[PDB]
Copies of this chain bind each other. A is one copy, B any other.
Amino acid sequence: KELSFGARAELPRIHPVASKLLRLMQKKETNLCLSADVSLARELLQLADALGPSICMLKTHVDILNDFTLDVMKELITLAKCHEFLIFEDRKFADIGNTVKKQYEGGIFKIASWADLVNAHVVPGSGVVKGLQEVGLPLHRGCLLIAEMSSTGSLATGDYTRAAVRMAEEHSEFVVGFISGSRVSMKPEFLHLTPGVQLEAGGDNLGQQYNSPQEVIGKRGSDIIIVGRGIISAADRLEAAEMYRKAAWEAYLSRLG
């Protein structure tokens, strides 16, 4: 029988980052992660401030910010603390352990210094997780494994998806969940976050496919919807985020019973 987000926050095997997230999802009645896909720092920060109360998480691609600096990230952390949301850098690491360790800690971006969560592809084998965890564990961070993708022709299916689940289970001190289209693990300690979400049917011209919050949360059993253009391209991004929040939240409640 299904446990609420608040009860899942207390599970014996829950990771601290997962428990913090689950508690603030419960408190704020939001299971919406904003995919803040913009190229300007000002717009990122204005969106994070205005939409912070509506979201449990703000997902970044800092490698698209034209005017990235570490001080931008400092100001994002201030907003995350004020409004209570996690920061998730959607870096989709996909290299050998020795290299990802470096890409996560170092370079210009110093991702591990500000991102509560990152994600990784499982294609390299479990060394990708070991390398990240070398940096992530001491910094008390968490990681999601990409078990399925939303795009047309995705190869993250079948035995590949099963491999991601096994890899997560086996690295539960660091791996807190999945990027997936549906519930892929039976274990309630794991979070399921789903990109490829819009209210209307459709896709983009470069292989993105959309499903609705009711489909993803209600029928497919995922926990959190990740929404970019459905919000970002709207005129009123605050009302769009509220639309998505209410959709995902009610789907969750109706699945809970």
Size range of the chain A interface in the assembly: 35 or more
Q: Are B126 and A207 interface neighbours, CB within 8 A?
A: yes
In the complex, whether A108 has a CB less than 8 A from a CB of chain B is yes
Binds B, one of A17-25, A91-99, A183-191: A91-99
Contact check, B208 vs A109: say whether CB atoms are below 8 A apart.
no
Q: Is the CB of A152 within 8 A of B123?
A: no
* Assembly CA distance A131 to B68 (angstroms): 23
Judge whether A64 and B106 touch: CB under 8 Å.
Answer: yes
Kindly state whether residue A222 has any CB partner on chain B within 8 Å: no
A112 to chain B, nearest CB (A): 13
Complex Cα–Cα for A155 and B167 (A): 12
> Copy number of this protein in the oligomer?
2
How far is it, in angstroms, between the C-alpha of A72 and the C-alpha of B155 when the chains are bound?
A: 37
B123→A154 contact, CB < 8 A: yes
Contact with B along A68-106 (1 / 0, CB 8 A): 100000000000000000000010101111110111001
Flag A100-133 by CB within 8 Å of B: 1 or 0 each. Answer: 0111001111000000000001111111101100
Any chain B CB within 8 A of the CB of A12?
A: no
Given the known A-B contacts A64-B103, A66-B106, A108-B68, are A122 and B155 also in contact in the complex, defined by CB atoms under 8 Å? yes
Once the chains bind, are B207 and A130 in contact (CB under 8 Å)? yes
**A107-B64, A107-B66, A127-B152 known; A206 vs B121 contact (CB < 8 Å):** no
Contact assessment for B61 and A124 in the assembled complex, using a CB-CB cutoff below 8 Å = no
Docked pose: A121 CA to B108 CA in angstroms? 23
**In the bound complex, do residue B103 and residue A61 qualify as a contact, i.e. CB atoms below 8 Å apart?**
yes
Q: Does A31 contact B (CB under 8 A)?
A: no
> Is there contact, CB below 8 Å, between A102 and B39?
yes
Residue in B closest to A204 when the chains form the complex, CB atoms: B98
- Report Cα–Cα, A181/B108, bound state, in Å: 31
Chain B residues with CB under 8 A of A61:
99, 102-103
Is A138 located at the chain interface by the 8 A CB criterion?
no
Bound-state CA distance A109–B128 (Å) is: 23
